Each structure stands twice: as structure tokens, then as C-alpha cells.
Ligand binder design. Sequence first.
Ligand SMILES: CN(C)c1ncnc2c1ncn2[C@@H]1O[C@H](CO)[C@@H](O)[C@H]1O
Ligand SMILES: CN(C)c1ncnc2c1ncn2[C@@H]1O[C@H](CO)[C@@H](O)[C@H]1O
Ligand SMILES: [Cl-]
Ligand code: NA
Ligand code: NA
Length: 351
Amino acid sequence: TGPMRVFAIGNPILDLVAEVPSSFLDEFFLKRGDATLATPEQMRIYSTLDQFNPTSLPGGSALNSVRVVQKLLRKPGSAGYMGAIGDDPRGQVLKELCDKEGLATRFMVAPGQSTGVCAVLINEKERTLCTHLGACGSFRLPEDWTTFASGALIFYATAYTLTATPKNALEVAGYAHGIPNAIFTLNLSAPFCVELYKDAMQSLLLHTNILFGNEEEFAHLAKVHNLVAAEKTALSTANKEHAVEVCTGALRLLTAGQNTSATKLVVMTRGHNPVIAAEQTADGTVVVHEVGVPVVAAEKIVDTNGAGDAFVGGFLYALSQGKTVKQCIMCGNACAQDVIQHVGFSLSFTF
Ligand SMILES: CN(C)c1ncnc2c1ncn2[C@@H]1O[C@H](CO)[C@@H](O)[C@H]1O
Ligand SMILES: CN(C)c1ncnc2c1ncn2[C@@H]1O[C@H](CO)[C@@H](O)[C@H]1O
Ligand SMILES: [Cl-]
Ligand code: NA
Ligand code: NA
């Protein structure tokens, strides 16, 4: 019942979270603390996980981010989402978890395929993630998606959606492009997305209003698109000056040297270090933002998985409220810091 403020596409994934012994990692040839896609030899990891009584929680990067938006906006249908699920029990579990939070969803069913699943394996204070996309790969944006999304001016896709087809994110960005107050936003998602989808992502960036990413994603973006000279490509983004150059070079992938009234903004999260952003303002001049990250002691950080997803959700919530760039970054920081200080990738009940 709306009004819908944010619309996103994603890979809808059920997260199965469990504490496992080290022999479980070893049996399945997992490297502790990595996040991978399930290999053939890892086929039975999800069924085998049942002996460790896992918890079932909604996951998927973009779904995490819009669930943050919906939690903060509170009214049912404040955020909308589409993706593909299987015609299996897991898909029903995920759908019902999303419905109970009031999110507006349309999940396309792929007969015969299994709903996306991610094993979140806890072991010696580290998370090890193993994801099987299944039905997520079948997603094809329906012809009436703009009607489902009616009223939303903020659109979001993760570069992870390119693994089904880049056409979904290109269609969503294509609708927003050239509309001064339609904002298409994109997450770089992972280093591999930057290389694997280089030319589709170059086109997509020309249609993008806000680009989010972390340091390693942007390092890969700078290398693949020659954004900085060879001599700078291995420089640390923990260095402010380097981070600023990378963001400023990435901004040209969004603006193509043009200046309109549309939003054109690149945001680099930097872990504990200040968020850095480069913005093309109304008259074409580029402004650089630096927003300090409140200190959180090592002892209080449970896990940083999901921090970026929550950052983006907080940023888009604040953007829907007409807040400034710096306020949107501060909201993203607040959401991310909540999530890293407890188990789970959702905002706390009391947030
Ligand atoms: C395409 N891949 C690898 C993925 N596509 C979308 N979401 C993913 C993902 N691999 C892991 N996830 C989700 O990442 C969240 C933590 O940031 C987890 O909820 C997990 O489901
Ligand atoms: C000490 N560390 C690692 C950190 N301390 C404080 N905030 C953190 C953080 N690592 C990440 N965050 C927050 O999550 C966002 C996305 O990584 C960072 O922008 C920051 O808000
Ligand atoms: Cl996603
Ligand atoms: Na402008
Ligand atoms: Na957490």
C-alpha cells in the first residue's frame, strides 16, 4: 500500500546460519573466511548442514539492503523488490519471511530449480560463506515492472544481478536515464563482477546516478578501466589522496564528461576509515566528501559481512528523505555499525 520509495532487483537467497566444527570446513574443502560459490564437490553441503541445526534468515545482498529501507520506512510496501526463486519449500520460506516484514515483492518462480541458498558457517570467530544461486539465475525482469514500481524514484541493483543477465539492470537504468529526478544506483558487489562484466558494466555506469563500492571493488574498477596510471594502480586506498583519485576517475564512468541536473555520485566505503565520495554538482564542478566513521572497538565487531549491504540501505533510506550526501553517508554508517555488532545481517529490533 505504499508509497513505494525504493525499487530493487536482486538474487533472493535464504541464509542458513550455523556454528560448525573445523572438520566441516575441511571435509568440504572450504577456506575459512572466504565467500564462494558452491563447487560440485560441495553439492551436499546444505543437506549436511541440517545436522548443525542452522537458522533460516532472509539473505541476498540487494534484499538485505531493501529490508533495511523497509524497516526504516515502516509503512507496508515502502520498498519493492523482484528476483527469481524456485518452486521448492525454501522459496516459500523466503517469501514468507519477506512478507512478514511488509516488503513489496514479486518473486518469479523457476520450475525445477532450487531457491538461492547461502551457508553462513561460523567457526573460530570467522564466517565462511558458500552460496548456490540456483533459480536466481533465471530472473528476467517482467514487462510490467514499471507498474509494480509505480511511484519509486530510487532504483537499485547490485552488480551481482549481472550473473543472471545484465539486461535486467540495463533495463532498470535505461528507464531512469535522462529523467532528472529518477535515480539509478548500483553496487559494484565483488571484484569478479568488475572483470567478468567489464563492457556491460561500462555501459550500465553511463546510466548510473550513484555508484557504491568498497576499496577492493574500486581497486579492480581502476585497473580494468585504467582510471589511474599504472604506477598508481597498486596504491593503498587507505591513503586519502589515492582514494580520492580513484573516486574522481570512477565518476567519469558515470558522467562521460557531460553535466546535467541529474545526480552523479561515486561512494567508496573504506572499512574503519572515512567514507570518501566524489560528486558532480549542479554546475559540473566536482566536490569531494569525507565522512568520518565512528570508532567501533575490535572486540565489539562480530562480523563485517553484510556491513556494505546495510550501508547502502541506510544511504538509500536517507536519500528517500531528501537528506544531503553527507547525511546519507552518516545514515549508511549508522546502519552498518548496528549490523556488524551483532549476529545477522538485519538491523536490530531496537534500532
Ligand atoms: C552472485 N552472488 C555471489 C551473490 N548474489 C547476491 N547475494 C549474495 C551472493 N553471495 C552472497 N550473497 C549474500 O550476501 C549477504 C551478505 O552480504 C548474504 O546475505 C548472502 O546471501
Ligand atoms: C574497525 N572496523 C573494521 C570498522 N569500524 C567501524 N565501522 C566499520 C568497520 N568496518 C566497516 N564499518 C562500517 O561499515 C561500512 C561498510 O564497510 C563502513 O562504511 C563503516 O560505516
Ligand atoms: Cl543481490
Ligand atoms: Na550536474
Ligand atoms: Na551482523
